[PDB]
C-alpha cells in the first residue's frame, strides 16, 4: 500500500515571463564618465558565474517568440529618454536660416536670428550646417530645419558618453535561464546540450544599420537565421564565423564654439575646420570581405533552391535604410555601401583595400516613428574607431537568381543574434509521489 | 530547488536530492529604469518562496526536504506500480502525468493534517 | 493560417508503388512540430500508420518493412512537404490517407505525451483505389 | 496494443435533445489521455476535445465531455443540423494509437 509523500526542490519546469534586472562588471560607471545605458545605477555587480549542464533533457527554443527581446527595446528606448529629459530644447532654432547657395561640402554657411539672455534682445549667428540636416524651402536662398513639421529637438547633453559597454540580464530567484549550447543552431527547433545559466553573457548596446558590428561571432558555420524564409518582408540575418575589419576616421578636425540662447542655456555651433578640409571614409580589406561574401552566397544557395545569388545596391527610403549608419565617437555616420554590396556571386576577387565615402549628420530621428528627435553636439577632435563586423542584415526582393539588398534597422534585429540561445523557464519545486513510509 | 539531474529517472535523483539542499546555501529607492526592475525582482522571490513555504507548512512537513503524509494512495490518481514509476519515468514526466489530480490531492493533505491535529488534543485531554 | 494540401487521386494495380506528399502553408518548421500519417478506410475507422517527430522516422508494427516516410522543411520557393511511400501495393490499400500535424512548442499542454500524440489539423485526403 | 470500443453505435435525436455517447477502453487511462473527433459526411475528422474535457478554440461551447477511469462520455446540448456526422474515440496513451470503432449520429 503506498502513501503520499511530499518532496520540495524536484527538478520540473515551465516557461514563463519575468522581469529580469541588469548587472555589470567591476568598473563603476563608465571609468567615471556618464553613460546613457546608465550601467552604475544597474550594478549588482557580477559574481562568479556558476553554469550546471543538464544532462539527457532536450528543449524546445524557438527565437521569434521570446520576451527578453522585447523587454529590451523598451529598455533601451527608455535608457535614452531619461537621459535626454534634463537636456536643452533646441526650440528657438527652428527659424529661416538664410544660407549662401552656390568636391563639394556639405557645409552651407548660414545665417539666422536667435534669442539671446536678456528676452527683449537678438542676435544674429553665423554656423555651418550640413546639408543633410538642412531642407530647402520653397543666391542667398532660404532653408529650414529637417524637423521643423514633425519633431522637437533636444540637445545631447556633452558630457554624457555614448560608449556602448556591456549588459548582463539576469533572473530572480525562483527563475532560472536555460542556453542551448549547440552548434550551428538554427535558432528554432529541438535543442540537445542545454545548460542552465544564471545570467546572460554579455551584450553591447549597439544599434547599426547595414552591418552588424561588434557582435559575437558564431561557433562553426555562417548561419542565416529568418523568420519565415519564404516571405519577402521578412529580414534574413546572418552570423559569421570570423570577422571583417572596418576602420572609420573624419579626417579634419574642427572647433566647437558655444552661444548663449535664454538664460542659462547653450547651443554649440561647429566652426571653421582648421587644417585641410578632407572627407570621412572607412577602409574595409578587399580580399576580407569577398571570401566571406562568398561563404553566404553558398548558405543562400542551400535553402533558396541552388540559384543565383545576385547582391545589389539598397533601393531606398529614409537616409538610415539606404546607408551603413553607426556612432563612432559621439558623431553618427551614415556611409556609402554600394562598393561592398554590388556583385554576382554563383564574384569579384579585386583585392584593393575598399574605401567608402561617409556623410554626417545632425539631427537624429527616432526610429519608431514618434515625434521626438536629437541634436548631436560637435565632437572637436579627430575621430578615429576601429570595428568587427560580424553580420549582415539582408532583405529579399520581389519575385534563375535571387537579388538580396542591404537590409535596414528594426533596433531589435541587432540584438537577435546575441539572444537567440536563451530561455527564461520558472522553476517549480513541490512534488508529490508514492511511497512506502506513512507517518504524517 | 534544484535545476540540473533533469533528465534522471526518480531513483537516481533522489538520491543526488540531499546534494541539491547540501552542496550550496541553495534557497530601489531611485525612479531610474534599473531601480524600478531591481525593487520588483525583489518582491517577487520574496513572494514565491512564502508562497512555497506557506504550501509546505499547512501540511505540517515544517521545512523539511522529503515529508512522509498519512494519506492512503488512490488509484484514480495513477496506476502504475513503484517499480515503473520510480525506475524509467522523470519527474516532469510524472508531473505532468499527475497535473490532474494536484488540487484533491493538496485538499485531501490539509484535511487529514487538521484531523490528525483533531486526535492529538483528545490524547492530552 | 493553418491549411493542408496533399496530391492527386490515382487507380493503380497491385505490384506497383505510389506515393502522396502533403504540403503544410502554415508550419515554420517541422523541428517543434509533427507529422502523422493516418490511413481511414472505406467503411471501418481509421488506422495508424508512422510519423516523423523530430526527423526521427518511424511506422507502426503493421507496416514496418513496406512503407516509407520522408519530410523537407522550408525551403526558398516551397513550404515544407512531408511524404509517405506505399510499397509491394495490394487490395487492401483501397482506401483514402492524411497527413496530419499537432503542435509540439510546448511540453504542458496536452495535445502530446511520449511522442504518441493527437491530430490536431487534418488535410482534405487523397482517394487511392487499386 | 490497447482497444476501444464505443457505444452507442448508431443513434437518433433531434434538435434540442441532450446526447450521450460514450466511450470505453480495455485498459485504466489514469492520465485522461482521450480525444474526440466529429466528421461530417465525407469530411476528414475534426478535433473537438482533447485531455478529457478540454476545448478548442473556435469551438460551440455545447460539446462538453466528462472522463472518469474507464467510462469516457461526450455530451452534445441543444443539438443543431451542422453538428451531425460521426464521431470517434481514441487513446494517446500508448503506442501505437487506437481509434473507436466508429459511431454515427443521424436525424
Known amino acids: 500500500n503506498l502513501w503520499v509523500t511530499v518532496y520540495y526542490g524536484v527538478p520540473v519546469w515551465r516557461d514563463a515571463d519575468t522581469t529580469l534586472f541588469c548587472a555589470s562588471d567591476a568598473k563603476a560607471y563608465e571609468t567615471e564618465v556618464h553613460n546613457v545605458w546608465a550601467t552604475h545605477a544597474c550594478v549588482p555587480t557580477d559574481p562568479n558565474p556558476q553554469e550546471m549542464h543538464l544532462k539527457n533533457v532536450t528543449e524546445n527554443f524557438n527565437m521569434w517568440k521570446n520576451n527578453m527581446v522585447e523587454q529590451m527595446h523598451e529598455d533601451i528606448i527608455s535608457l535614452w529618454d531619461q537621459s535626454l529629459k534634463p537636456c536643452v530644447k533646441l526650440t528657438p532654432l527652428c527659424v529661416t536660416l538664410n544660407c549662401t547657395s552656390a568636391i563639394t561640402d556639405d557645409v552651407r554657411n548660414c545665417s539666422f536670428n536667435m534669442t539671446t539672455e536678456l528676452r527683449d534682445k537678438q542676435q544674429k549667428v553665423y554656423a555651418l550646417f550640413y546639408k543633410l540636416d538642412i531642407v530647402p524651402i520653397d543666391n542667398f536662398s532660404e532653408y529650414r530645419l529637417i524637423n521643423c513639421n514633425t519633431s522637437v529637438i533636444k540637445q545631447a547633453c556633452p558630457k554624457v558618453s555614448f560608449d556602448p559597454i556591456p549588459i548582463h540580464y539576469c533572473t530572480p530567484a525562483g527563475y532560472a535561464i536555460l542556453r542551448c549550447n549547440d552548434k550551428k543552431f538554427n535558432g528554432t527547433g529541438p535543442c540537445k546540450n542545454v545548460s542552465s545559466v544564471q545570467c546572460t553573457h554579455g551584450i553591447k548596446p549597439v544599434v547599426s544599420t547595414q552591418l552588424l558590428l561588434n557582435g559575437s561571432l558564431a561557433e562553426e558555420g555562417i548561419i542565416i537565421r529568418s523568420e519565415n524564409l519564404t516571405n519577402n518582408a521578412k529580414t534574413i540575418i546572418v552570423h559569421f564565423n570570423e570577422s571583417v575589419k572596418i576602420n572609420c576616421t573624419r579626417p579634419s578636425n574642427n572647433t566647437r564654439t558655444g552661444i548663449h540662447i535664454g538664460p542659462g542655456q547653450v547651443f554649440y555651433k561647429t566652426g571653421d575646420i582648421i587644417g585641410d578640409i578632407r572627407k570621412a571614409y572607412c577602409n574595409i580589406s578587399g580580399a576580407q570581405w569577398h571570401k566571406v561574401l562568398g561563404r553566404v552566397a553558398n548558405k543562400l544557395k542551400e535553402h533558396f533552391n541552388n540559384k543565383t545569388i545576385v547582391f545589389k545596391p539598397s533601393s531606398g527610403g529614409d537616409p538610415e535604410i539606404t546607408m551603413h549608419s553607426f556612432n563612432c565617437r559621439g558623431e553618427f555616420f551614415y556611409c556609402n555601401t554600394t562598393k561592398l554590396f554590388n556583385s554576382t556571386w554563383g564574384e569579384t576577387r579585386d583585392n584593393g583595400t575598399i574605401t567608402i565615402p561617409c556623410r554626417i549628420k545632425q539631427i537624429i530621428n527616432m526610429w519608431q516613428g514618434v515625434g521626438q528627435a536629437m541634436y548631436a553636439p560637435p565632437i572637436k577632435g579627430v575621430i578615429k574607431c576601429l570595428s568587427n563586423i560580424t553580420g549582415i542584415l539582408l532583405t529579399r526582393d520581389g519575385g534563375n537568381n535571387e537579388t538580396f539588398r542591404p537590409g535596414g534597422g528594426d533596433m531589435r534585429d541587432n540584438w537577435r543574434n546575441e539572444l537567440y540561445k536563451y530561455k527564461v523557464v520558472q522553476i517549480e519545486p513541490l512534488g508529490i509521489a508514492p511511497t512506502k513510509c506513512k507517518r504524517r | 530547488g534544484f535545476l540540473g539531474a533533469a533528465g534522471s529517472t526518480m531513483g537516481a535523483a533522489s538520491i543526488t536530492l540531499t546534494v541539491q539542499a547540501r552542496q550550496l546555501l541553495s534557497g530601489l529607492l531611485q525612479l531610474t529604469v534599473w531601480g524600478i526592475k531591481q525593487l520588483q525582482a525583489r518582491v517577487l522571490a520574496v513572494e514565491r518562496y512564502l508562497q512555497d513555504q506557506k504550501f509546505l507548512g499547512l501540511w505540517g512537513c515544517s521545512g523539511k526536504i522529503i515529508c512522509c503524509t498519512a494519506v492512503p494512495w488512490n488509484s484514480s490518481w495513477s496506476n502504475k506500480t513503484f517499480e515503473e514509476i520510480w525506475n524509467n519515468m522523470t519527474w516532469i514526466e510524472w508531473e505532468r502525468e499527475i497535473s490532474n489530480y494536484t488540487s484533491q490531492i493538496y485538499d485531501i493533505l490539509t484535511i487529514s493534517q487538521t484531523q490528525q491535529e483533531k486526535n492529538e488534543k483528545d490524547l492530552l485531554e | 493560417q493553418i491549411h493542408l494540401v496533399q496530391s492527386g487521386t490515382e487507380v493503380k494495380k497491385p505490384g506497383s508503388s505510389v506515393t502522396v506528399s502533403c504540403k503544410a502553408y502554415?508550419?515554420?518548421?517541422?523541428?517543434?512540430?509533427?507529422v502523422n500519417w493516418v490511413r481511414q478506410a472505406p467503411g471501418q475507422s481509421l488506422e495508424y500508420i508512422g510519423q516523423?517527430?523530430?526527423?526521427?522516422?518511424?511506422?507502426?508494427?503493421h507496416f514496418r518493412g513496406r512503407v516509407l516516410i520522408s519530410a523537407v522543411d522550408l525551403t526558398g520557393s516551397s513550404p515544407p512537404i512531408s511524404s509517405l511511400e506505399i510499397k509491394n501495393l495490394t487490395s487492401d490499400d483501397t482506401a483514402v490517407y492524411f497527413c496530419?500535424?499537432?503542435?509540439?512548442?510546448?511540453?504542458?499542454?496536452?495535445?502530446?505525451?511520449?511522442?504518441?500524440?493527437?491530430?490536431?489539423?487534418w488535410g482534405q485526403g487523397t482517394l487511392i483505389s487499386v | 496494443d490497447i482497444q476501444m470500443t464505443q457505444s452507442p453505435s448508431t443513434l437518433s435525436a433531434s434538435t434540442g435533445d441532450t446526447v450521450r455517447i460514450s466511450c470505453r477502453a480495455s485498459?485504466?487511462?489514469?492520465?485522461?489521455?482521450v480525444a474526440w473527433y466529429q466528421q461530417r459526411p465525407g469530411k476528414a475528422p475534426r478535433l473537438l476535445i482533447y485531455?478529457?474535457?478540454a476545448l478548442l478554440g473556435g469551438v460551440p461551447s455545447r460539446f462538453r465531455g466528462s472522463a472518469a477511469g474507464t467510462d469516457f462520455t461526450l455530451t452534445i446540448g441543444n443539438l443543431q443540423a451542422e453538428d451531425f456526422g460521426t464521431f470517434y474515440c481514441?487513446?494517446?496513451?500508448?503506442?501505437?494509437?487506437?481509434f473507436g470503432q466508429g459511431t454515427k449520429v443521424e436525424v
Open positions: 485531455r478529457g474535457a
Open positions: 516523423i517527430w523530430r526527423w526521427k522516422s518511424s511506422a507502426s508494427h
Open positions: 485498459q485504466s487511462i489514469t492520465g485522461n489521455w
Open positions: 481514441q487513446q494517446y496513451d500508448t503506442y501505437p494509437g487506437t
Open positions: 496530419t500535424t499537432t503542435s509540439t512548442y510546448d511540453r504542458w499542454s496536452g495535445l502530446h505525451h511520449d511522442g504518441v500524440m493527437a491530430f490536431s489539423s
Open positions: 502554415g508550419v515554420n518548421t517541422f523541428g517543434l512540430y509533427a
